[PDB]
Amino acid sequence: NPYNKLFEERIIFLGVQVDDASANDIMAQLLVLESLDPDRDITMYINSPGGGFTSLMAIYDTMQYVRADIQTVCLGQAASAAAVLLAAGTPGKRMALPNARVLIHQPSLSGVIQGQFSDLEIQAAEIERMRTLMETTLARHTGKDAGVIRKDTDRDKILTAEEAKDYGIIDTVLEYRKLS
Amino acid sequence: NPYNKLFEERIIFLGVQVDDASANDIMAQLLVLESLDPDRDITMYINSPGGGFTSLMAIYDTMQYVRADIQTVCLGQAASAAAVLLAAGTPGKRMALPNARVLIHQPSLSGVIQGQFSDLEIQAAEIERMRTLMETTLARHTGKDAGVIRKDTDRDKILTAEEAKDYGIIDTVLEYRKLS
């Protein structure tokens, strides 16, 4: 496959909705490439709409765990969890294509989860723990103050790649090799 | 596959919802790796939302049966059934990534099961036998007193990895090999 040629040249590929199926694939891909060459950089292509916080922090911790530096590249979209994974690459790395759409926003619940108010006090203490962790993670990777991340991810914050570089999500906007 | 490279280096991979399909795979993976090297440690990666008690205790008994010590590693989530399997690893082992979400809670019935009150007296004596077994299992693996497990798993108890180490679910929070 063309994906197998990318993985042979150490490019993991996010591509799809970050869920339990997609996170488990990427962590398997990150650890194999750590075992093949622990000193050669893994490249991560991100065209994902995000979603899923434990699937985020499964991918996030694994790409922070491996000895190989992660070169994240945003393709067309890094929305929600995928924008956190985009900032999760190594400093001096974390490219994005010039018309990529970085979308940061606070965690949500997809649909209503029912329960007693003691059950919902805990599902809300968790979604604030998920929110604070999403803002703490996106602060040491962007250089922001977490409180700025909280004010900015209050709503959907769509970043163009040229202003995701100013935000600290990425470090360089990826110049084209041919003008075309 | 990248999963085949993980299994070649003796890493079983939970990954998905613990059900009859997923438990049967992991038990097949645990016994093959016992037959290949009974003295070399099986590593278990857990990114599961849990569910299923007999599928839990199928995986649980098999990873306790094999001569190989089980190194459980929580990836992004170990939520009930999977958090019991996370504590089910060998002491001196049982890692978790720093943003893993350990979720312990008492057994439930997914949906309503109907019947006569003599049928439901038995489905409730079983869900208390399932509850007591889940608290007895999570007591000799965490060092708690089962009554503390019963008071704590009364509701959803979400543990961060740093406080799942204090709880006894895991033994060390897994430091990153590169800072990134």
Place this chain on the structure above:
Amino acid sequence: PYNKLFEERIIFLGVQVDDASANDIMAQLLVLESLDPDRDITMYINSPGGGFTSLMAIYDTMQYVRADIQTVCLGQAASAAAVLLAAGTPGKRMALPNARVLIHQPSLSGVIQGQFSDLEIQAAEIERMRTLMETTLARHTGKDAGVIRKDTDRDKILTAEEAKDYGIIDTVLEYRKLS
């Protein structure tokens, strides 16, 4: 990993006992009879059961083969699967210590309609299925079938340590490492 288990003569029940699963296990039981008729077939059971003719298809085949059947309950042997768990050879029939053996009388999944002469026969069959399930689970447990009828009146969940006292299994399987 299933092929490595089958190479070492371990059939694997695993799923809901139906016409698809019974036909697989009978194919697996007869191949292993042809490979080594004197070496024991091991049967791993993690099934929720269901299906009586799929039960008695697996049951008769594991009784037919010359190889002794070592049944091992993994996490669950329910309905038809607990009968298959007792269907192993005496001196065999292990179960893991937190296995859940569930014996109960046969049921009809959903309503089957018909005239009362049609339903007199579907009920004479579900009593023939019930009596056969209690007769089968009596010569494999050493009980008196009437005790099986009183015990499988409702769901009887057995822990592995009390499925050994019941006669479903013969030994509760000790762990090789403490861990």
Place this chain on the structure above:
Amino acid sequence: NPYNKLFEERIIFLGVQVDDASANDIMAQLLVLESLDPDRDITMYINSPGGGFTSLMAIYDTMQYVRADIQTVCLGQAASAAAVLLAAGTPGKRMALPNARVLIHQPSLSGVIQGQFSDLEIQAAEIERMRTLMETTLARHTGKDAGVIRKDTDRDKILTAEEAKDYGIIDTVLEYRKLS
């Protein structure tokens, strides 16, 4: 596959619902084994719930056509068409396992077929032609008088294997090779 090892030793396998897909497979299996060894007996394993009359008489005519004698073996169930195919084996053959369930009953229409009363006069003359053919077929293979077959298949007639031998469906109840 284990089925391929059975077919290599000349065992066709009914297994599933007798329909147009299953009948076409068995007729392909019966003719290949006629071409391989026309003098060595084809064994037919039957665990089917039956159904389908033209799929029955497709299998029935083919296992009567081939030069190889057909050894039918009922596994757990020979219901409806399956029980006619069970009786369709060669005399001196037609085994059944001791807890097999032979179920003979008259043909039915699965669901309602609509139409004018001239259309339904023909769909009923056919279901009586199907009924008479099912009773004529099950008379020269059981030694009954067809009128006895009509009185017995008036309703569902479930036969135990020991009383399907007395009925003439099978010729011997298959003794176990090991007691176990």
Place this chain on the structure above:
Amino acid sequence: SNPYNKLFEERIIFLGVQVDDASANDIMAQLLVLESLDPDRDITMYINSPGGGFTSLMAIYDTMQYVRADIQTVCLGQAASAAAVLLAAGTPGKRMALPNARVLIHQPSLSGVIQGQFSDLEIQAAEIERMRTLMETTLARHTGKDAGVIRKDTDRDKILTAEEAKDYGIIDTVLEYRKLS
């Protein structure tokens, strides 16, 4: 190798399923390959089909009439609607059927309602009469009947036993068993 591949190696195409655009396209591919392999050795056609589809019928029909190889049609358990026309479409001196085969001839139908203006439906009815007349013309030069007899007989479902599909001209011989059993 599948058992179907062993049948196709010995030049047996196999109808088997509902005659539709998927099944007709397979059989025409099978008929032309076997024409290219041996154009002088007979293709055998096994028919256990419930029929259906008129352009899928006449796709199979024209191809088994086109090929130089004589077609030996064999009805297995059922030849209904389009499949009974394909059963009669074999070569004379051929066209077997098993003794309990069910040959079902009936006039073309529309599966479900097709809507439209009455000028649209005048044409969908002139076509279903063109389909009916073609089904009766085709089943007349292969059965020796007079098309008007075919029209009177396929007015309703006409189920033929194989012994009376031979008297009807659908098949030419009822296939005797090689062993009594």
Place this chain on the structure above:
Amino acid sequence: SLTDSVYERLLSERIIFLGSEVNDEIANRLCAQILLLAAEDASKDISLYINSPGGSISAGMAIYDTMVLAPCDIATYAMGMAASMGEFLLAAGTKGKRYALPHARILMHQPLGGVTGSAADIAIQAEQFAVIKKEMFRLNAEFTGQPIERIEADSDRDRWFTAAEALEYGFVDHIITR
């Protein structure tokens, strides 16, 4: 309601409507209306206007028996469509009092049904379908005055009639044009 109020005021003028598919609910309504109107005046005609796509045989046989056993003459009126049981109950009116409106269409066809169940059940259903179809054809032969062989031949598939063709065939006695 409004529609029930107009029907009630025409029930007072002894005008009842078979205006839908003849099922048991519409039949028991009409049978109740014919019993109610025959109890009020046993000598005045009941006008049954039929705009019906047909319906159940036994539902229309309930209406037909209530039409016959009413001492009133049931004047029937083909109004737009008298198909199946609608043509039956149209032709079931009092002789001399079966009317077709000039653009009503009459559909005589053999009864529809469905066979299901076991082959012994279907052998009984077809035995009863032959009984129902013979009596439905016998009554259409009695109503129209046609032979039962012509009724069986014409009502083999859908046999449509205009108001003029139904007058010649015998379903109606007059085509009213006012």
Place this chain on the structure above:
Amino acid sequence: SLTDSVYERLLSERIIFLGSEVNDEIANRLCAQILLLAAEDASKDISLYINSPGGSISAGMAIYDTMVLAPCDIATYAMGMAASMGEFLLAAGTKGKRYALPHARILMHQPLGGVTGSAADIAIQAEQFAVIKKEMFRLNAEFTGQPIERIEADSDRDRWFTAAEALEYGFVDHIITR
């Protein structure tokens, strides 16, 4: 309504209708109507016209018990169809007052049901199905005057009757033709 208004005016003339499937809602309606009409005049007949495809045994046993315990004579009228519980409640009318309209059809067949649940539940359901079927056959033997062996034999599958065949068999006492 209109349909309720015609039924109410026939309720005033002591004419009630079993015009649908005998479920508990129609049975409790008829049981209420028989109790209401037996309270008004305890000596005038109640005319129960039956256009029914059958229904629940216990619903029709509610009607049958209300028919018997009413001091009124319940004249029953087979109107189009009296299948299952409809034939039962038809034959359950007062002797001498069970009528078939001349084209009503009578369907006597053994009760339908469904078994479900565990094998100890089904053994109770079939024990009770044998009780229901024996008492349903005993009452059809009492109504028709046929032996219970003939009722059990004929009502094994669907056994259809015309109005003339039901008169010979014993479901009705007269075929009214007015």
Place this chain on the structure above:
Amino acid sequence: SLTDSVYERLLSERIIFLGSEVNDEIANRLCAQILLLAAEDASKDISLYINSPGGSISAGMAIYDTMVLAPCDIATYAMGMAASMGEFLLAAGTKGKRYALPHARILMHQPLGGVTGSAADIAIQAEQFAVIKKEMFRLNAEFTGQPIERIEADSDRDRWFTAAEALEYGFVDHIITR
């Protein structure tokens, strides 16, 4: 309506109907009717005719409490079917005034329910199912006069009664045959 009009006229004659599944809507209707009829005449009997397949425990306990606290004697009538809560409210009638129609069937069985939620919720539901089943058996033991051990044994699965068997068992006091 018609059905509501016949029920209203029997409400005027102090005859109420438990004619469906005992849910909260039918229970609050009957509880309102018993409160309405006990307010009109506090000394005349209320006739509760029961054609019921059972229903909610708490809905039927609302009816049972309204039956007991009414100063009227609630005459109950097993009409066709008194199953589950229907048998309970039948046997809950005034002693001497619990009637079975001769072909009514009585179904005494232990309550149905459903467990759901977490294991601490189910431990509460089963604690409450043991409370409900003990009090349901205590009251059926009080009504029928049977021991609570016999009520618990017989009402373990479906235990069907005819009218004669329910008279011996104690659900009804008379089998009325008029």
Place this chain on the structure above:
Amino acid sequence: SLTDSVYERLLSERIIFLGSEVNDEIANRLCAQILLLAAEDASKDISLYINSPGGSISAGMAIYDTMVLAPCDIATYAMGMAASMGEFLLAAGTKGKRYALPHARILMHQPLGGVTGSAADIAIQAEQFAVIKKEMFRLNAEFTGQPIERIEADSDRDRWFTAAEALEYGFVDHIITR
């Protein structure tokens, strides 16, 4: 209707029913009935009979505010089931006039809800769930006379009461037995 006619006649006798789930439609009906009955006679008691599985907090707070601000004393009656908002509005009756029928069951449990939306929305919902649960527990502590710590402890999961246990706990003031 019939059911509306019996409820209207008990509305004339100042008896209203909370007989279903407390949603806004039933609450606005009861709030309208309490406002209507307090306008007719401002000194006669309103009898609120409660057969309720609980319901919306704000719907039952509408009823509770209409109960308090009515100059009438709202006598509440646990009839079969007073769960959730049903137990709340039962215990919300006038002190001395909160009644349990002897087999009514009382279910006190903490409120159910659902969180959804973004984490800033859920932080507001949980802030408001803590406000609702504190005020629901404060009022159940005010009604029953129990401490708010005992109300919070007992109403953590489902806490069932019989009529005698609810009398000891404080939901009702009397168990009426007439």
